[PDB]
Amino acid sequence: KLVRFLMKLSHETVNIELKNGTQVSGTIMGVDVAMNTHLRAVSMTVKNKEPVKLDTLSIRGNNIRYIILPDPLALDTLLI
Amino acid sequence: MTSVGVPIKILHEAEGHMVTLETVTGEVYRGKLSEAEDNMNCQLAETVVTFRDGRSHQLDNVFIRGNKIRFMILPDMLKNA
Amino acid sequence: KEDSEQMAEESSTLHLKEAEDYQGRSFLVPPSFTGVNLREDYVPERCFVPKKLVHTYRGHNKGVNFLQWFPKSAHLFLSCSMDTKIKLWEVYDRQRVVRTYAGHKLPVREVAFNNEGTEFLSASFDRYVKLWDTETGQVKQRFHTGHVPYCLKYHPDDDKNHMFLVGMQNKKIIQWDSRSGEIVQEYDRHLQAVNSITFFDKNRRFASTSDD
């Protein structure tokens, strides 16, 4: 079930897309099932704006359009 | 015993004073508040709306449905709670 | 009793204080002390287990012996007592008071609202049916009888809310108009007294049950 992946998902690096055509790249450190996303060591790339770096960021996971996942993350065991 | 409804207690304290809210159409409303619900529906009696150019209008009543809206600004008095 | 006799004995008195709240609207029809639906459907949801007593409704001097609901709602119910008084009660977790109607020398047996709801007729051992105005609290009609009335039904139609059938101790059914008070027709084919009457077609035909 998808709920297992969101709670287990931590420490890996992901790229995040937001409703305002905005792209974010950050590493995750959080343990909960409700998709609440907390980021540390973040880089930000807003549409029609220059890139900026952020030390920490927090995002409501429901607002995220889609998340890009890293190569070594064996999703198959998390999805089951 | 019961211990639930902490935002509702704060929401009750916000009643009777003046609130500011913005809509998805982009204009800003200023109004006096005295109605609340668990489903976040709210109603304002006496209201003034101001647009992002220079036009303003007065409204006697506005009803807000809690699930298809942008968020409202609550009075400062709540900080005392 | 005569009109002047029941009036001179002060058979009705006013004691309500909350007759109005914020506006001069009626208090019987709308549930003005509630935020629930003012008029309610017959089935809101699938039924659930009952729970607890709201209140004992302390106030009557004698036992309680009939129950009736208010038209198109369950917020207000009507009760008839052997104490010859009729009172209303609120059931949606409320304990407010309502005005008392009384005018019978002998116990009340049964009460029916009119289908429009602003009037109710009350049958008593004193062999009269009296017409009350719920908002006004006054009576100004009185129908006599030969024999004992055993059953009252109002007509099933809104227009014909003035016609009603009376089942007697004598075995006839007789139909009266409440505006004239006159015998419009007699039906006489049952053995013994007629106990109850039941319509099988609105404004067309009726069945009747008797000790026949």
Added chain:
Amino acid sequence: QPVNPKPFLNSLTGKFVVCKLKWGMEYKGVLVAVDSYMNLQLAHAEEYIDGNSQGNLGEILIRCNNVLYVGG
């Protein structure tokens, strides 16, 4: 006499129906779907935009929120 939407959808089910999306895109497809969200699924579907035929598609999955048409 009136009919409820669920058997009505069943009456439309298996027939040939015209569809249009709120964004202004049109499709024609065969439909078999029952779910609490009332979603739709179409197979071997033809795409139309502004009244012009664009392409024949295969099976397509479309959410209930964006669709507002079903009739044939």
Added chain:
Amino acid sequence: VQPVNLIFRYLQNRTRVQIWLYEDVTHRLEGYIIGFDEFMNVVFDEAEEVNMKTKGRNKIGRILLKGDNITLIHAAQQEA
């Protein structure tokens, strides 16, 4: 009065009503109705769609319109 019972008044009287749609839509439909449910879904028949870019009408036979997508409903009048 209730919307479902009022829909019963339209279908019993064969009323022609016009329905408007929400979100990013610019179309008007004029049609007769035969449908009821507690969710106020609408079954639309003998319908005509007006294209506001050209004010042209096309004939439509028996369609279902989901109530959540529906905005206003009113008794139809000619538009040109």
Added chain:
Amino acid sequence: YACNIDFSPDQSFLISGDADGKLFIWDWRTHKIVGKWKAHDSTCIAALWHPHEKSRMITAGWDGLIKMW
């Protein structure tokens, strides 16, 4: 006795109240008896199911009080 038999919109289930201070319910589909509820502490003839509420009953007694369930 003239027990006030009741047949709510729930009429698939039959409801009645009787002088024993007990309430009995029958199923029309299988004609069986299935009901165990009680009201008051004395003999009475009064039983109504609320025609506009999903889970409330009202009862009256000769003690001079009215009770709800």
Added chain:
Amino acid sequence: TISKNNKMMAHLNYRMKIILQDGRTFIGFFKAFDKHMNILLAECEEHRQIGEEKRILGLVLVRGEHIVSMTVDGPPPRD
């Protein structure tokens, strides 16, 4: 920060930045948490894009659904 009660308490007494659906950016103090993610924002300042503009604001309550991005970075606060 988001939703979790224990995380909510740790982030208090710091300066927090908000960005919403309409491109405005807000910076404010906060001392409240609703588990459905409603927070009370105090001493807030807003920036507007037409040019650039700034306004001085009264105290605010914010609904998490509208929040697009939130970050925490601040010195010891003012009361």
Added chain:
Amino acid sequence: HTIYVNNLNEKVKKDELKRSLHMVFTQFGEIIQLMSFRKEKMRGQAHIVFKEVSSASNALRALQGFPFYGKPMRIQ
């Protein structure tokens, strides 16, 4: 405290008349209650309600026969 007003100037626009009449009565006293109309029978007329008879009396005495927008209004 209710009066019927007649012989008002009909050419004054709804907003201008309402403001003008609003300005006149507030000058006489703490009176602010007015509804004005321009329909066929209603034109040139208004019904006004006063807070107190004393404020009404002072205002009434001054306005009776006073030229306003070049025309004499009447008060009852």
Added chain:
Amino acid sequence: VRLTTELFAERPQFVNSVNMREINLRGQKIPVIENMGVTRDQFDVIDLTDNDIRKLDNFPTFSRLNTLYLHNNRINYIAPDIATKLPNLKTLALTNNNICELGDIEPLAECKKLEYVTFIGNPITHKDNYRMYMIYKLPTVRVIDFNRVRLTEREAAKKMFK
């Protein structure tokens, strides 16, 4: 009584017949206008009728204030900066005041958005060419002393001074 910050809270704040927001300060023995800033321009209308105000000055800068009532006061001078304090003021009523000279209207001329004025009862009404000077000096004003201005009166005022 004094126009302190406490007076604004204690006095009624209410919405008037034109849906504007009005504050009541009538007859409060006010000799000088002050402390209005506490309102923070939150009122659309300010009512200072029947007071003892000697001068029209000391107003804070307000932009929402559309209409100001100053009937029956004793004001006999107008500050030149009144246009800077109340630039969006459309109505200024100085009925029954003691305005005697044209020099006091020159500050009102700076109010490019002033539209409605009243001087009934002021001594200035007695002065020669009183109406024509106002019409020429105040072309933006639409109504004077609860009466209309004819187009023929507008040309006559301009022609006289030209």
Added chain:
Amino acid sequence: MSKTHPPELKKYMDKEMDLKLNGNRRVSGILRGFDPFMNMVIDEAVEYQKDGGSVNLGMTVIRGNSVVIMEPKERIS
């Protein structure tokens, strides 16, 4: 728990009011409708169009979730 009742609609029902719609359209109508779904029922209404004249709306229904903006002509007491 307990939740809450619908608002005191009785104080505002049966009055005549103007309604505002997205796209700067105006409607003037009398209102008399309430339901647990919080829909709206409008009657004897007239539309003021942005691209045409005006038409009268015969017994109008508005879905409660979609649109709710009201301007009344009678002052509440």
Added chain:
Amino acid sequence: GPLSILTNSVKNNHQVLINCRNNKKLLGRVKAFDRHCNMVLENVKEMWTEVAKDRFISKMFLRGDSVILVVKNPLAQAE
């Protein structure tokens, strides 16, 4: 149900072509299903007109509330 399409698409490792609400198109392999139609995409190809631009994504996660339209292409090449 529509999940049948999801499950069979997932089980046979086929590709699906997806188009976004405004500008972008995607081609990707899928392995996720739920009542909210949340999906996880693998071996994803992204194409959109800003000039034509192309970006490769190995693994992707798509939430089911910001929903986009899915078309299945079993004729695209498999892995």
